[PDB]
Amino acid sequence: AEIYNKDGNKLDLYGKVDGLHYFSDDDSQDGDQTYMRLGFKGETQVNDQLTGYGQWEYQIQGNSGENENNSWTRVAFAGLKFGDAGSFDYGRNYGVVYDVTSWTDVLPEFGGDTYGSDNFMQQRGNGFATYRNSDFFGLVDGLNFAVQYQGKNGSASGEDQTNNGRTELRQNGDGVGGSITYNLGEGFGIGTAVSSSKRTSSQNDLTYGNGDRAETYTGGLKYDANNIYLAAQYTQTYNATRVGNLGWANKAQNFEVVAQYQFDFGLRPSVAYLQSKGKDLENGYGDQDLLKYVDVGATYYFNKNMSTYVDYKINLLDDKEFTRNAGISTDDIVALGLVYQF
Amino acid sequence: AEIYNKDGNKLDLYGKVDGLHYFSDDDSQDGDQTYMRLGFKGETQVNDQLTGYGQWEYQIQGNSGENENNSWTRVAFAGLKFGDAGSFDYGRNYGVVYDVTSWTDVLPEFGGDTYGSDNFMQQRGNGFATYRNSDFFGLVDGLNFAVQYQGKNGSASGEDQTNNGRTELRQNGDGVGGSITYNLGEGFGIGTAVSSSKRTSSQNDLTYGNGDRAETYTGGLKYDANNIYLAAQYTQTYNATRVGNLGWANKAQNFEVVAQYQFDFGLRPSVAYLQSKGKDLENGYGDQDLLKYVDVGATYYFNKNMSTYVDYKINLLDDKEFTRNAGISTDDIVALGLVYQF
Amino acid sequence: AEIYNKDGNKLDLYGKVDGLHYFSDDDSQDGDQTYMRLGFKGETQVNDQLTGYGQWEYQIQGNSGENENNSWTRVAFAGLKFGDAGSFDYGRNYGVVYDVTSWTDVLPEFGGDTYGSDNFMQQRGNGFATYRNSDFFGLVDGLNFAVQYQGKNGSASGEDQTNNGRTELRQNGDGVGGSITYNLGEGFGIGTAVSSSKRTSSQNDLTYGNGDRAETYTGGLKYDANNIYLAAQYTQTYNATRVGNLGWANKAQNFEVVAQYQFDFGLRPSVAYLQSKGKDLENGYGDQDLLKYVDVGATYYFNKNMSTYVDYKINLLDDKEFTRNAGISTDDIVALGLVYQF
Ligand SMILES: [Ca+2]
Going by C-alpha positions, the residue among A28, C186, C83, C124 that lies closest to residue B62 is C124
**C-alpha to C-alpha distance for C12 and B15, rounded to whole angstroms:** 13
Look at residue B82 and give its three-state secondary structure. coil
**C-alpha to C-alpha distance for A37 and A24, rounded to whole angstroms:** 24
Cα→Cα distances B228→A166, B11, B222, B255, Å: 58, 33, 10, 20
Torsion region of C136: left, alpha or beta (phi above 0 gives left; psi -120 to 50 gives alpha): left
**C-alpha to C-alpha distance for C176 and A102, rounded to whole angstroms:** 57
Cα→Cα distances C76→B341, C127, C241, Å: 12, 10, 24
CA end-to-end distance (rounded Å), chain B = 6
CA nearest C12 in A: which residue? A4
**C-alpha to C-alpha distance for C247 and C240, rounded to whole angstroms:** 9
Cα→Cα distances B297→A53, B261, B312, B317, Å: 49, 11, 6, 19
Q: How many angstroms away from the CA of A53 is the closest CA of chain C?
A: 6
Going by C-alpha positions, the residue among A330, A270, A267 that lies closest to residue A301 is A267
CA C195 to chain centre: 15
**C-alpha to C-alpha distance for B100 and B179, rounded to whole angstroms:** 8
**C-alpha to C-alpha distance for A25 and A332, rounded to whole angstroms:** 7
**C-alpha to C-alpha distance for B167 and B155, rounded to whole angstroms:** 6
- Would you call B31 and C127 a contact, using CB atoms and an 8 Å cutoff? yes
Going by C-alpha positions, the residue among B301, B314, B234 that lies closest to residue B262 is B301
What residues contact C221, with CB distance under 8 A and at least 6 apart?
C103, C188, C189, C190, C191, C231, C232
CA A183 to chain centre: 22
- Would you call C162 and B34 a contact, using CB atoms and an 8 Å cutoff? no
Going by C-alpha positions, the residue among B233, B328, B254, B315 that lies closest to residue B285 is B328
Look at residue B318 and give its three-state secondary structure. coil
What residues contact A324, with CB distance under 8 A and at least 6 apart?
none
Q: How many angstroms away from the CA of A302 is the closest CA of chain B?
A: 6
β-pairing verdict for A251-261 and A267-281: antiparallel
Half-sphere exposure of B25 toward its Cβ, with a 13 Å CA cutoff? 8
CA end-to-end distance (rounded Å), chain C = 6
**C-alpha to C-alpha distance for C209 and B114, rounded to whole angstroms:** 46
Cα→Cα distances B158→A23, A30, B119, B163, Å: 18, 13, 21, 11
List residues bridging with B53 in a β-sheet: B43, B79
C59 neighbors C35 (Cβ within 8 angstroms): yes
Binding-site residues of B sit at 152, 159-160, 199, 201, 210, 239, 250
CA end-to-end distance (rounded Å), chain A = 6
Going by C-alpha positions, the residue among C214, C226, C235 that lies closest to residue C103 is C235
Say which DSSP state B126 is in.
E
A112 neighbors A103 (Cβ within 8 angstroms): no
> Which residues in C lie closer than 8 A to residue A166 (C-beta atoms)?
64-65, 67-68
Look at residue B112 and give its three-state secondary structure. coil
β-pairing verdict for B31-32 and B50-61: unpaired
The burial class, CB within 10 Å (0-12 / 13-18 / 19+), for A260 is buried
Going by C-alpha positions, the residue among B37, B78, B21, B35 that lies closest to residue B54 is B78
Going by C-alpha positions, the residue among B288, B271, B291 that lies closest to residue B279 is B288
Chain A partners (3+ C-beta pairs within 8 A): B, C
What residues contact C44, with CB distance under 8 A and at least 6 apart?
B302, B303, B305, B306, B340, C8, C9, C10, C51, C52, C53
Going by C-alpha positions, the residue among B302, B17, B305 that lies closest to residue C54 is B17
Going by C-alpha positions, the residue among A230, A260, A225, A214 that lies closest to residue A97 is A214
- Would you call A64 and B40 a contact, using CB atoms and an 8 Å cutoff? no
- Would you call C76 and B34 a contact, using CB atoms and an 8 Å cutoff? yes
A272 neighbors A258 (Cβ within 8 angstroms): yes
Look at residue C120 and give its three-state secondary structure. coil
H-helix or E-strand containing B221?
strand B213-225
> Which residues in A lie closer than 8 A to residue B154 (C-beta atoms)?
27, 31
- Would you call C338 and A90 a contact, using CB atoms and an 8 Å cutoff? yes
Using CB atoms, pick whichever of C46, C71, C162 lies closest to residue B27: C162
Cα→Cα distances A302→A97, A339, B97, C27, Å: 33, 10, 31, 51
Torsion region of C142: left, alpha or beta (phi above 0 gives left; psi -120 to 50 gives alpha): left
**C-alpha to C-alpha distance for B91 and B93, rounded to whole angstroms:** 6
Look at residue C39 and give its three-state secondary structure. strand
C58 neighbors C39 (Cβ within 8 angstroms): yes
What residues contact A89, with CB distance under 8 A and at least 6 apart?
A53, A77, A78, A79, A80, A128, A129, A130, C19, C338
| Residue count (chain C) | 342
Breaks in chain B after (C-N > 2.5 angstroms):
none
> Which residues in A lie closer than 8 A to residue C72 (C-beta atoms)?
none
Using CB atoms, pick whichever of B3, B17, B22 lies closest to residue C77: B17
Look at residue B201 and give its three-state secondary structure. coil
Half-sphere exposure of C335 toward its Cβ, with a 13 Å CA cutoff? 25
Q: How many angstroms away from the CA of B92 is the closest CA of chain A?
A: 6
Torsion region of B315: left, alpha or beta (phi above 0 gives left; psi -120 to 50 gives alpha): beta
Torsion region of A135: left, alpha or beta (phi above 0 gives left; psi -120 to 50 gives alpha): left
Going by C-alpha positions, the residue among A36, A111, A94, A93 that lies closest to residue A70 is A36
Cα→Cα distances B318→B314, B326, C341, Å: 12, 13, 55
Half-sphere exposure of C190 toward its Cβ, with a 13 Å CA cutoff? 2
A287 neighbors A324 (Cβ within 8 angstroms): no
Half-sphere exposure of A169 toward its Cβ, with a 13 Å CA cutoff? 16
- Amino acid identity of residue C320, one-letter, is K
β-pairing verdict for B9-24 and B286-303: unpaired
Tell which CATH classification among 2.60.40.10, 3.40.50.80, 2.40.160.10, 1.10.1380.10 matches the domain C1-342: 2.40.160.10
Using CB atoms, pick whichever of C3, C17, C30 lies closest to residue A163: C30
CA C29 to chain centre: 20
**C-alpha to C-alpha distance for B207 and B126, rounded to whole angstroms:** 25
- Would you call B91 and A340 a contact, using CB atoms and an 8 Å cutoff? no
Cα B84 to ligand 1 centre (Å): 63
> Which residues in C lie closer than 8 A to residue A42 (C-beta atoms)?
305, 340, 342
Cα→Cα distances B62→A61, B168, B280, C322, Å: 21, 28, 40, 35
Cα A209 to ligand 1 centre (Å): 5
Binding-site residues of B for 3-deoxy-alpha-D-manno-oct-2-ulosonate sit at 152, 159-160, 199, 201
CA nearest B116 in A: which residue? A66
**C-alpha to C-alpha distance for C170 and C148, rounded to whole angstroms:** 18
What residues contact A339, with CB distance under 8 A and at least 6 apart?
A16, A17, A18, A19, A306, A307, A308, A309, B54, B78
Using CB atoms, pick whichever of A52, A78, A170 lies closest to residue C67: A170
Neighbour count for residue A180 (Cβ, 10 Å): 17
The burial class, CB within 10 Å (0-12 / 13-18 / 19+), for B44 is buried
Q: How many angstroms away from the CA of A163 is the closest CA of chain B?
A: 16
Using CB atoms, pick whichever of A71, A73, A161 lies closest to residue C28: A161
What residues contact C90, with CB distance under 8 A and at least 6 apart?
B19, B21, B34, B338, C77, C78, C79, C127, C128, C129, C130
Half-sphere exposure of C144 toward its Cβ, with a 13 Å CA cutoff? 18
**C-alpha to C-alpha distance for B219 and B312, rounded to whole angstroms:** 26
> Which residues in B lie closer than 8 A to residue A265 (C-beta atoms)?
none
Neighbour count for residue B322 (Cβ, 10 Å): 22
CA A112 to chain centre: 6
> Which residues in B lie closer than 8 A to residue C153 (C-beta atoms)?
31-32, 63, 65
Say which DSSP state C138 is in.
H
DSSP secondary structure letters along B42-67: EEEEEETTEEEEEEEEEEEESSS-TT
Domain coordinates of chain C in residue numbers?
1-342
Using CB atoms, pick whichever of C1, C28, C306 lies closest to residue A11: C1
H-helix or E-strand containing C176?
strand C175-185
| Residue count (chain B) | 342
- Amino acid identity of residue B50, one-letter, is L
Neighbour count for residue B263 (Cβ, 10 Å): 12
Say which DSSP state B184 is in.
E
- The four Cα atoms A23, A24, A27, A30 give a dihedral, to 10 degrees, of -20
- Would you call C19 and A89 a contact, using CB atoms and an 8 Å cutoff? yes
Chain B partners (3+ C-beta pairs within 8 A): A, C
Resolution in A: 1.5
Say which DSSP state B321 is in.
H
- The four Cα atoms A232, A238, A243, A247 give a dihedral, to 10 degrees, of -150
Cα→Cα distances B237→A116, A327, B201, B250, B257, Å: 46, 41, 19, 8, 18
- Would you call A21 and B127 a contact, using CB atoms and an 8 Å cutoff? yes
Going by C-alpha positions, the residue among A110, A69, A98, A122 that lies closest to residue A249 is A122
**C-alpha to C-alpha distance for A317 and A292, rounded to whole angstroms:** 6
Say which DSSP state B204 is in.
G
Q: How many angstroms away from the CA of C138 is the closest CA of chain B?
A: 25
Residue C56 phi, psi (nearest 5): -145, 140
Cα→Cα distances B167→B155, B246, B301, C282, Å: 6, 12, 39, 45
Say which DSSP state C200 is in.
P
Going by C-alpha positions, the residue among C134, C263, C283 that lies closest to residue C206 is C283
> What's chain A look like in SS3?
CEEEEECCEEEEEEEEEEEEEEEECCCCCCEECCEEEEEEEEEEEEECCEEEEEEEEEEEECCCCCCCCCEEEEEEEEEEECHHHCEEEEEEEECCCHHHHHHHCCCCCCCCCCCCCCCCCCCEEEEEEEEEECHHHHHCCCEEEEEEEECCECECCCCCECCCCCCHHHCECCEEEEEEEEEEECCEEEEEEEEEEECCCCHHHCCECCCCEEEEEEEEEEEEECCEEEEEEEEEEECCCECCCCEECCEEEEEEEEEEECCCCCEEEEEEEEEEEEEEECCCCEEEEEEEEEEEEEEEEEECCEEEEEEEEEECCCCCHHHHHHCCCCCCEEEEEEEEEC
Neighbour count for residue A84 (Cβ, 10 Å): 12
Going by C-alpha positions, the residue among B170, B101, B105, B111 that lies closest to residue B291 is B111
- Would you call A9 and C1 a contact, using CB atoms and an 8 Å cutoff? yes
A227 neighbors A266 (Cβ within 8 angstroms): no
CA nearest A77 in C: which residue? C19
β-pairing verdict for B286-303 and C333-341: unpaired
The burial class, CB within 10 Å (0-12 / 13-18 / 19+), for C16 is buried
- Would you call A52 and C305 a contact, using CB atoms and an 8 Å cutoff? yes
> Which residues in A lie closer than 8 A to residue B166 (C-beta atoms)?
64-65, 67-68
The burial class, CB within 10 Å (0-12 / 13-18 / 19+), for A224 is middle
Using CB atoms, pick whichever of A52, A72, A92 lies closest to residue C340: A52
H-helix or E-strand containing B135?
helix B135-139
C83-C87-C91 Cα angle (round to 5)? 150
**C-alpha to C-alpha distance for A269 and A249, rounded to whole angstroms:** 33
Cα A73 to ligand 1 centre (Å): 31
> Which residues in B lie closer than 8 A to residue A21 (C-beta atoms)?
90, 127, 151
- Amino acid identity of residue A27, one-letter, is D
> Which residues in C lie closer than 8 A to residue A37 (C-beta atoms)?
none
Neighbour count for residue C294 (Cβ, 10 Å): 14
DSSP secondary structure letters along C261-322: E--TTSEEEEEEEEEEEEEEETTTTEEEEEEEEEEEEEEEEEETTEEEEEEEEEE-----HH
**C-alpha to C-alpha distance for A17 and B91, rounded to whole angstroms:** 9
